[PDB]
Design a protein around this ligand. Structure first.
Ligand code: NAG
Lengths: 516, 516
């Protein structure tokens, strides 16, 4: 398999995205952002470090001279998003309190590196898996960036969640400015200092985020408030600069007496037929696939026991609506201690709560303590699940799941009884290193780009050729595979010469015979 | 004695100031600010509350509807300062997050009450003894207010110390705005969240403040940082909107093996001759008089053991200069743990440190751990000292010291050996009510206005008539008293008929015989 090695064993890989039109592979790494061809040949290597820094220097070196002692510091890639409408890449690092660069897609030339305003500094956190962003731009206009990050106990320096202006012009003076910033109403959420005094390790880790319909969603993990942890879905309306639409519910999944409530990884996709039926949704609707490890404790040293589950966005929005309706009836409390700092009674008010409700000055920010439960598809306790991607093939949701021992599981989402069935597991990383969260399909869906800390590998979505009889091929459980009869070969339909002619491609067990 | 009683029983007096030209007496009270005559007849009673409020309402009712449950709430007066150049009074209360009013001196007509910006809310604290201000205005020009306050753990909402615009025009849109407010430099100090996580009862009480020379001074009490308390002098340059001149040193005094380091009260005045000789300063120079309780612990329930001591401003500034020169030579550390949050080494730089030094971006904010030691003048262990005022009469410093049992001590400062000698104690409040900090002279210096929580009383500075022979009178130790020979009466010079004529007023013991 095509593979790209880190140039240094120390400068590990962080993030990966694939341009959905050109097919170029962009990789964010320590001290580097790379542009690779589809087969993982380097085209551009853009250097982001190392550099002289100290994270006690606020503001950074470019603005003021600093007082504390500097050390050569690696630049951890924290964020890597293609800004599609504008043919550029947003790359945010850990250096200098977490400044971002905008880079031209073609050659990674620096368009702008805003480093003079307080909001130009996203976060001084130097851990990955702590920040996530979503660009909302109606194609061809000025845009907005929702950015969620851990703040490292630096509550006043960095909001944990905010929206920023992402104008068309890279040199606009409004670049990364808050959408709204005023004395009492701003497009940002700060961690309150009282929560940090109560829970000293307190911080919020943003594992994933996506847009779906009129809303953006962030998936978070954080210490629980009076070591237990809570995984949550956080939702905002796309048009809500006041942030009155903030709602946060816990989420997780369970199966056969086990609870999985520590979020590891997630991926938004469309469901195949049987999964759509199990949810009573159409196959056109969005479904969130998520990996959770067992229980609610020791987040930083998780057990191998883990699960893949699935949440339709419709069901998420429904549970949020019923929460809003209840609260607006005066029932219960807001239930978001970490942000509200105390019990806050829900206030009864005559307000229509429909699907598109985006909050008012009361009853917000809204939480809850009843979790959104997912449909568990697959579980294991031998090899911890670490990443997920999914797509539809031959009417089946196919879910690819990375493990901590560098394997890739292929799971067919069949529905009851099992929910999902693993039909194959492949060794990707010889060294047995964990697969990292970011996996993305090539434009033609023929491959999934998968990565470890030291390698990016282009893994074919199928290797049907391994099956050497019609019977084995069609009994494999792999939705990609059928029997190319005249060429004595198991393959995808489109890899079978003259597949359209009668008896040339057997797509079922019984067709093995009729083909013969 | 002329007395003014409070109109309710629970609506206690908080603050007092005498207009230095007109002799009008202004009293800050719970739910009232009064203007009284020199003999304590009400002229104006200005209603400041009670009003429905909740101190969890931020921003307060007056600018937003609040979902919180409100109680009818008393308005504690927390600040009362005459703005001399502008014929107005600044009156800050506890209601609505600590909004302030400017009232016309004549009739207490409301000139302005700022409450649309976040800086218009000084602090939701509702206890007295926590806030102090200093107006710095070149006469007939736009000016500035320095404001220190306790914040009750709401460090996100209110800075502990800041400088504000005080424009001549009461209707300026910039009224009480920060003098400087920008991303990385502002005319304010915030209490770090880390310090509150470390010490959860942490807060800073501003007991007194004054201008002298190029500088403003604030006298503070706060818990120590790793229950011990530190009393400090905090100094700023009058022209330093960047607050780079901030220097904070502990202060206190000692006598005969006892340490007194819990600040209770202060008053700035000129020294008489014995005191000025003792400091080796001019009688034209400022001296700070201070009351300290014994030790460094249990600030809220202090020992009766207390001291009066004096600090020449010249010596305070010298010790600060020495501190600044040492630090700019690279010796030691900044030593201000509550604000800096950690150990910070002093940075050597080739910078002249003269008397007028106002700091640069390095080596600030500056602290220190060696106390400024005052000259102890008087100690007691029998009845706690609560207030202080001083002036010069017949070339002597006379210090008036209030007590917790409603008494007023009169202390003559003679220097070595005793430092000071009490020559009279007077029972002001028969019921034993503690004397409050704010004591002020009438403009003819004939009286000291003294208050308890329930009364304001106009106390003659002498009652020489009590001594009924020449010998007793001139041995009284009371600097006010001489013998009016013809009228056989001990009195002040200006109460002795034809005192200007030879032999009519015996001002020494040998003059008893010749006047007879
Ligand atoms: C990968 O693809 C490029 C074309 O983009 C091709 O020229 C190159 O030879 C390929 N690399 C390998 C190892 O086959």
């Amino acid at each position: 398999y095509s593979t790209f090695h880190s140039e240094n064993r120390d400068w590990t890989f962080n993030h990966l995205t694939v341009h959905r039109r050109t097919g170029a592979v962009y990789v964010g790494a320590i001290n580097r952002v790379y542009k690779l061809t589809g087969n993982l040949t380097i085209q551009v290597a853009h250097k982001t470090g190392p550099e002289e820094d100290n994270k006690a220097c606020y503001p950074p070196l470019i603005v003021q001279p600093c007082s504390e002692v500097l050390t050569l510091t690696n630049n951890v890639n924290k964020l890597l998003i293609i800004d599609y409408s504008e043919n550029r890449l947003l790359a945010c690092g850990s250096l200098y309190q977490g400044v971002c660069k905008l880079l031209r897609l073609d050659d990674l030339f620096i368009l702008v590196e805003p480093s003079h305003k307080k909001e130009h500094y996203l976060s001084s956190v130097n851990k990955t898996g702590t920040m996530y962003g979503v660009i909302v731009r109606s194609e061809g206009e000025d845009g907005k960036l929702f950015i969620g990050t851990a703040v490292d106990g630096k509550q006043d320096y960095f909001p944990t969640l905010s929206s920023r202006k992402l104008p068309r012009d890279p040199e606009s003076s409004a670049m990364l400015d808050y959408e709204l910033h005023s004395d009492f109403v701003s497009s940002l959420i700060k961690i309150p200092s009282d929560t940090l005094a109560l829970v000293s390790h307190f911080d919020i880790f943003y594992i994933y985020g996506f847009a779906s319909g009129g809303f953006v969603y962030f998936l978070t993990v954080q210490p629980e408030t009076p070591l237990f942890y809570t995984s949550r879905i956080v939702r905002l309306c796309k048009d809500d600069p006041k942030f009155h639409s903030y709602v946060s519910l816990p989420f997780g999944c369970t199966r056969a007496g086990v609870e999985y409530r520590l979020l590891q990884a997630a991926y938004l996709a469309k469901p195949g037929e049987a999964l759509a039926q199990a949810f009573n949704i159409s196959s056109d609707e969005d479904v969130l696939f998520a990996i959770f490890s067992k229980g609610q404790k020791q987040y930083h040293h998780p057990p191998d026991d883990s699960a893949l589950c699935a949440f339709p966005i419709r069901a998420i929005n429904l549970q949020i609506k019923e929460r809003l309706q209840s609260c607006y009836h005066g029932e219960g409390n807001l239930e978001l201690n970490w942000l509200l700092g105390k019990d806050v009674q829900c206030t009864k008010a005559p307000v229509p709560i429909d699907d598109n409700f985006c909050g008012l000055d009361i009853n917000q920010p809204l939480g809850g303590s009843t979790p959104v439960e997912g449909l568990t598809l697959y579980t294991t306790s031998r090899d911890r699940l670490t990443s997920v991607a999914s797509y539809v093939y031959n009417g089946y949701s196919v879910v690819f799941v990375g493990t901590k021992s560098g394997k890739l599981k292929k799971i067919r989402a069949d529905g009851p009884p099992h929910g999902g069935v693993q039909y194959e597991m492949v060794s990707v990383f010889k060294d047995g290193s964990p697969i990292l969260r970011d996996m993305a399909f090539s434009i033609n869906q023929l491959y999934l780009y998968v990565m470890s800390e030291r390698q990016v590998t282009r893994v074919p979505v199928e290797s049907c050729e391994q099956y050497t009889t019609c019977g084995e091929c069609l009994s494999s459980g792999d939705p990609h595979c059928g029997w190319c009869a005249l060429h004595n070969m198991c393959s995808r339909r489109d890899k079978c010469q003259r597949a359209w002619e009668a008896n040339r491609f057997a797509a079922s067990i019984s067709q093995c015979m009729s083909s013969r």
